[PDB]
Amino acid sequence: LVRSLSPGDIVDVTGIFLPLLTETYLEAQFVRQHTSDVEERVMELITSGDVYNRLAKSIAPEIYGNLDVKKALLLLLVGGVDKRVGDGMKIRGDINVCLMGDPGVAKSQLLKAICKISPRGVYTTGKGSSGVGLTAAVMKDPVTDEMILEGGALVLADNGICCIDEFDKMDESDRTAIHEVMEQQTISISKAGINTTLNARTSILAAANPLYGRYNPRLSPLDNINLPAALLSRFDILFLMLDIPSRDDDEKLAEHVTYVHMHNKQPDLDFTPVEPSKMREYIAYAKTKRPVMSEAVNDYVVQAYIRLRQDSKREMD
């Protein structure tokens, strides 16, 4: 049975639990990696046919007016297709989302909700919980002089989602490592003679306040971020949740929040969101699929790209 397990795997191992205090261990016998019992629950939702909006309204049922943001979160939870190009090439099939916004726009509650919903979500604040909490390091074992890995925020979130609140405060040693994780899904460490690469298959969801604290309508948008273009290019669905006072919009959000703290329900009565237990199964089931597009829309994309590509030349100046 040797060379079956590998580091970082999630497995169910069957064995015998064997031993004036006795020390205990397990003798491995059978190992497996990670259904009609849940197919019935999956059948109910697809029977209704409400797929995008229902699940997008299901995530964070106590947050007002963020349907467009939630939809991006819904896709990020599901993710794309990790296309193995071949010939040694590789293209990531994950979605990275950045949530810029003014203070008091509930852009951190989404970070909590994403970590709660995802089975592999990791919640992180500040400077990536310092440089030691971010990335990873090799630690010597004083008992056997061996060196083993101690997983940080990104390494733990492997095959998962990493939320980084207050991302603008991240140091250069923090953000430079983010580039390789965002782009390569791997972390390369060369310290104390050790030259190893770590699996960092993570979805990065960052929410941060403007560079100058807040947004005033006279301010240009690029001046409200501390991030260069390379980071903004590696993000997708780059949001900008500006807060503009309004007697007809603050009224709705206030009424939405005040009902959340008043009763144990969302303010909407005509719509009931899917419970997280059923959401997890449907998302997992949906994630198993591998759709492939047609050549007709393939030619459609190159036309729409050029349409969007040419506009930005005028817009930037």
């Binding site: 040694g88 430079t176 490592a177 390369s188 460490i189 060369s190 310290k191 260069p228 273009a229 393939n298």
Partner: protein
Amino acid sequence: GTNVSIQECTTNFRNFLMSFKYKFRKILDEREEFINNTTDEELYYIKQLNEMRELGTSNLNLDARNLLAYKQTEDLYHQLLNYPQEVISIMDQTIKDCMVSLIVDNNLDYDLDEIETKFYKVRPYNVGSCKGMRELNPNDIDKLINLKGLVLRSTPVIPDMKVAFFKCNVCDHTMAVEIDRGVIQEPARCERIDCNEPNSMSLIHNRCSFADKQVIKLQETPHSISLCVYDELVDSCRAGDRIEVTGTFRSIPYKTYVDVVHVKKVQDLAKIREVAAREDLYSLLARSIAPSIYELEDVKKGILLQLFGGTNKTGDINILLCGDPSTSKSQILQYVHKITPRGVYTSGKGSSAVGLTAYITRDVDTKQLVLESGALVLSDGGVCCIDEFDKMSDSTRSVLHEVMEQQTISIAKAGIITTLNARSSILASANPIGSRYNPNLPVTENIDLPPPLLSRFDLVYLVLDKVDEKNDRELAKHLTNLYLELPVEFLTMYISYAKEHIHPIITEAAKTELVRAYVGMRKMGTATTRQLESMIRLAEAHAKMKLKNVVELEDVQEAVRLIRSAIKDYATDPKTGKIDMNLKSVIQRKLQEDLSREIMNVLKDQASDSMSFNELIKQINEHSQDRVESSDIQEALSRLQQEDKVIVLGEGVRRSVR
């Protein structure tokens, strides 16, 4: 299982040694065209025996592949992988027989008197390729295997006991007790009849006889296992060396280790020729490297020329990629380290000053100098990929100068004074200063590298992102055609062949081109002499792709052009360093006007009604000044024909007006 029938094996080896021909080597590898009847027909191992008996060396090199190249020894090849000791005794007897039979029984000479007493040993080395250290299993114990790796720590020459010297403490009688299977038998009584005192013997330490034992540590992957070395195999390995090992896997209480038995420290030929002489060779090779990346011909060539390399003589080429942070930079570097042997992937903040530099320290018990490897030491002879090369720390960036130019890392710290070797090639990618490339600032202000570092790179590629749909749409098609539903083996086989056999030499004619190209480049006054050696290395790398024994004008001119295209010289203003975003002027209009008028004058002035384009070129273009491209002449005559001023009846002739 003592499967060794000693009479059978000594008979097979007698057959093997006295009948093997060098010709049989070409059959297993199917090199039938490589049969040379002038030398391969003679017996192979008999020549070694004639040498080692005359040299006085007690060793013979056993190339284990020749066992498979002979039919009877095939039954012997499998059992050799389990029982090597019996062969050694057979070989010793065979050498003794060889001296007796081939020299004195043949009455050739008598230079064998001492050979009767000396002990020989034959060491098999070329066992078939093995599965590596990490694949070994407990069932492999005591079976000869093969490994490769890197040396880290070497212990000094430990003297191992073989003969014990005892002296009686009351009568001073001296014995000579040998070691039998690693045990020392201490006499309990003096051996003399007169002196019979019990426990009267004593061991004298410095009159004993010892044998050299060396313990060497080898690292194949970052795992590593301990090795044991004995006898005349000392003084063969030092820290930091790369070794191929053929030895025996052991275990003693668990302590798995290798009884090293040998140490090494150093049909498709027609298929290569069929690609060698083709016309689209350069484009096909350049395209093949990155099938997922569109166009970028110049980027393809240089990075390919990086893999070919220069020619070290009694050579590495480094490249920097500067461009907007959305264009193919990362993908090529990922390909390079996954297509080159033992490449290392590095980043700015992911490494340290002791990341690329091996951590040299001194042993706490043997007090020798040991090294714990490093990025620039692991990739010796290979390619190191560095992302975010701009964001490298200044201390980390500082140590590159000696590495890039002298391929050494000297360290002077408390108690340690030594220098290493880190000969390697560097591939680096750097984002532009700020967010995106700005043509308003000069080229040197968009690069965060000081001139001393910036001068070392052989090629700096300015990769710029345009908005022209004439190339965007083609790129879009190339990307979109890849996510619905030469090969790398040919490429690596091609590359591995060229680096092994091709050693080009610069010719006299090609010498002048290098001089003039640098002088002209210098005359525009950052043309340090580090760029001139960059031209020569690229010149050798081009011919290595060409698989030609020499480097010639086309190689030099293409190398000059590649540097020109990489740096984007002609599109850069010579007095401000700014980039011309536009790359028919009135001066060009005047040039074509005068060229057409001169073509008319030549056509009407010559005493022939018609002439060929080659005749016109010889008369005008090549007659004076450096030859200009004939396309302009063709364009002018085509314009005149469209205006009905000249007659073009065919490609080979041009005729006067009607």
